[PDB]
Amino acid sequence: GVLMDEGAVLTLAADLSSATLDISKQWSNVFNILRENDFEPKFLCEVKLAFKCDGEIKTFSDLQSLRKFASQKSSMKELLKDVLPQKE
Amino acid sequence: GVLMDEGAVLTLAADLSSATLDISKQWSNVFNILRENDFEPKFLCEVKLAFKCDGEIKTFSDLQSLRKFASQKSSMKELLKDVLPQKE
Questions:
Q1: Which of residues 19-78 of B touch A (CB under 8 A)?
Q2: Given CB atoms, is A8 within the 8 Å cutoff of chain B?
Q3: Of the candidates A46, A25, A58, the residue with the CA atom closest to the CA atom of residue B65
Q4: So where are chain B's domains?
């Protein structure tokens, strides 16, 4: 009868179709109103770990990619060891 | 000292060249070890607002696109009218 209906939008595959990552194009007001009115907003995404390593900031949007880095990192080798098999 | 150089890495235009959208293919361990070792991991990324709106769960990874939604949504028009320009 009366409804504002949306159709069906396909999903893009980040590993299967084309390598896709995140980059901030948004601003400071994030789900604030939704948090107050309890719309139960989300907050889980493929965060790119922009962390400080050896003097430079790294950006990893994939732990699989970070695995390749952490493994050959003598220091980080003993850090990610718990989720990534080490010992070379 | 000698260490580990890399090649040449570039970035992607956020929505300017192609739509930047987040899709979770990661698992449970979210940069935990990096935090415990104080590499200072990130967290600020383009998250999808997977919230309950009008009975259905919506996913908005781009709040710009959400502005297009809440403007036609009378319900959310009364929520976001405080931050978004509403003449209605």
A1: 20-27, 29-31, 33-34, 37, 39-53, 59, 61-64, 72-73
A2: no
A3: A25
A4: 1-88
